[PDB]
């Protein structure tokens, strides 16, 4: 079996991407944030505190003839940004782009943090990291990909995120028309539950490539590219007027600037992030100071190849017995 679904930026800055997911019988369609950095499928629901719901589409399990309360099960998660959510658990039928899993754990929110409430375009998350990170207690639950794996033509999913435009998540096959040249595969560590790999280095604009090992995670659920402070300093040094701002919380730059590209290494291959992808617009409405898309990972504790990097590539999440990651230009 295979599945294929279109993923859409939630706003003009590509702050995140949503993908339609069918849950329950009859189908209830929710727009979820596919997140290769976490492993819970959770949704706004009929159970969510009313004051915490503001424009989102909810899952109503009492209206699904295939929904079953998972007795005694609860979940609670806190994300790298500082947001969180929690509730109970149903099992139900979940389909993505024509691919169906029966008995998927659907985590129903009773509480969500303000940042979720304030984001009317995201109805929940669909986690695609490794199931070892799933927060359901007392019995851990499997991710959608893990449940589907055995049925897929090939145990893979691919992420093809667009710059200011729609893209695609495919399950079970590689669309050879979606990329240029070849796919370079690179080793993955699952020891932290993430799609964790090691980049072979970087370049800034037309500058010389610096060979250096950068350990990080491929994370569709993170907007920006978070790298070591030395690397990030080297990048913003090439932008006149750029500076790290304590008050804003990162590197900012004059909106009139033209940004250089940023290249990262995958083995001997190279992925080029166009400079336009690194512009996240005014820090506040009407300001001529703009927020940068490459930021320091110091104090995160891990480097993050988020959307800024991944949308410059066709990315293969290979879930074979020994997982690997593949990157191609497009």
């Amino acid at each position: 079996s295979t599945g294929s679904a279109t993923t859409t930026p939630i706003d003009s800055l590509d702050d995140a991407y949503i993908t339609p997911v069918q849950i329950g019988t009859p189908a209830q369609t929710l727009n979820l944030d596919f997140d290769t950095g976490s492993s819970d499928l959770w949704v706004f629901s009929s159970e969510t505190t009313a004051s915490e719901v503001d424009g989102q589409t909810i899952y109503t399990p009492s209206k699904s003839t295939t929904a079953k309360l998972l007795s005694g099960a609860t979940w609670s998660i806190s994300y790298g940004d500082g947001s969180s959510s929690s509730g109970d658990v149903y099992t139900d039928t979940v389909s993505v782009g024509g691919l169906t899993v029966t008995g998927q754990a659907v985590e129903s929110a009773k509480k969500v943090s303000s940042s979720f409430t304030e984001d009317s375009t995201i109805d929940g998350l669909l986690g695609l990291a490794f199931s070892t990170l799933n927060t359901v207690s007392p019995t851990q639950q499997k991710t959608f990909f893990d449940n589907a794996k055995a049925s897929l033509d090939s145990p893979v999913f691919t992420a093809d995120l667009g710059y200011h435009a729609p893209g695609t998540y495919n399950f079970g096959f590689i669309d050879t028309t979606a990329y240029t040249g070849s796919i370079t595969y690179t080793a993955v560590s699952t020891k932290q539950g993430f799609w964790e790999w090691t980049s072979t280095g970087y370049a800034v604009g037309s500058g010389t490539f610096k060979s250096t090992s950068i350990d990080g995670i491929a994370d569709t659920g993170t907007t920006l590219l978070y790298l070591p402070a030395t690397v990030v300093s080297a990048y913003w040094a090439q932008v006149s007027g750029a500076k790290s701002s304590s008050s804003v919380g990162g590197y900012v730059f004059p909106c009139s600037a033209t940004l250089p590209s940023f290249t990262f290494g995958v083995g001997s291959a190279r992925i080029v992030i166009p400079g336009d992808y690194i512009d996240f617009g005014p820090i506040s409405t009407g300001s001529s100071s703009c927020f940068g898309g490459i930021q320091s990972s110091a104090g995160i504790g891990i480097n993050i190849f988020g959307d800024v990097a991944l949308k410059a590539a066709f990315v293969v999440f290979n879930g074979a017995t020994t997982p690997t990651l593949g990157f191609a230009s497009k």
Side-chain angles (χ1 to χ4, degrees), residues 1-62 64-67 69-109 112-141 143-148 150-190 192-242 244-330:
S1 67
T2 63
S4 176
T6 295
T7 193
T8 306
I10 64 158
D11 60 27
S12 65
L13 295 176
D14 296 350
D15 277 321
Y17 298 76
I18 48 174
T19 312
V21 177
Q22 282 69 50
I23 307 173
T25 318
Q28 306 180 31
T29 301
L30 273 66
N31 297 330
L32 307 186
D33 188 349
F34 284 26
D35 181 11
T36 59
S38 71
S39 306
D40 289 48
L41 196 176
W42 77 260
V43 299
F44 278 78
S45 71
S46 61
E47 299 179 323
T48 308
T49 301
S51 64
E52 297 183 353
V53 184
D54 185 15
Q56 298 80 7
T57 294
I58 58 167
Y59 169 60
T60 302
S62 66
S64 172
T65 54
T66 41
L69 182 67
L70 185 63
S71 181
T74 59
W75 65 276
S76 179
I77 186 166
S78 306
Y79 294 102
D81 54 356
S83 65
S84 65
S85 49
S86 65
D88 49 18
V89 186
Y90 292 82
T91 56
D92 209 342
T93 301
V94 173
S95 305
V96 174
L99 168 64
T100 300
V101 168
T102 55
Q104 173 69 41
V106 175
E107 297 170 41
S108 171
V112 306
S113 75
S114 59
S115 73
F116 286 112
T117 303
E118 295 161 5
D119 186 8
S120 63
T121 72
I122 295 176
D123 300 329
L125 270 61
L126 191 152
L128 297 166
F130 293 92
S131 289
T132 49
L133 299 178
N134 181 262
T135 78
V136 171
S137 176
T139 310
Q140 268 204 323
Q141 302 293 302
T143 66
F144 177 80
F145 178 51
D146 238 55
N147 281 327
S151 308
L152 296 174
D153 290 1
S154 187
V156 303
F157 69 90
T158 68
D160 183 7
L161 306 179
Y163 168 66
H164 295 344
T168 304
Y169 280 100
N170 287 330
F171 292 85
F173 73 104
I174 289 157
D175 179 359
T176 59
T177 71
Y179 58 86
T180 61
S182 66
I183 307 177
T184 295
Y185 290 88
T186 196
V188 167
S189 176
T190 63
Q192 291 188 66
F194 301 122
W195 290 92
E196 189 173 359
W197 63 292
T198 299
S199 171
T200 47
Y202 71 97
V204 176
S206 58
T208 51
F209 185 86
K210 174 74 170 184
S211 295
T212 181
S213 292
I214 303 159
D215 184 307
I217 67 165
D219 187 1
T220 57
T222 290
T223 314
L224 304 185
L225 172 55
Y226 294 90
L227 297 173
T230 50
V231 178
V232 179
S233 181
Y235 176 83
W236 286 111
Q238 294 307 308
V239 181
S240 315
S244 188
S245 158
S246 154
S247 64
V248 178
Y251 281 87
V252 298
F253 68 96
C255 290
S256 67
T258 298
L259 301 177
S261 62
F262 184 91
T263 299
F264 63 97
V266 187
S268 63
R270 307 283 179 257
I271 296 303
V272 183
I273 304 168
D276 282 2
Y277 292 22
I278 297 152
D279 178 6
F280 276 76
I283 63 178
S284 284
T285 306
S287 179
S288 62
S289 175
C290 275
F291 196 69
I294 295 174
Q295 298 291 343
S296 177
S297 63
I300 296 181
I302 204 169
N303 300 301
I304 307 170
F305 295 88
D307 299 335
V308 167
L310 302 183
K311 70 185 177 186
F314 179 87
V315 187
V316 182
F317 294 81
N318 173 25
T321 304
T322 298
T324 59
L325 265 177
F327 294 84
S329 296
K330 66 192 184 188

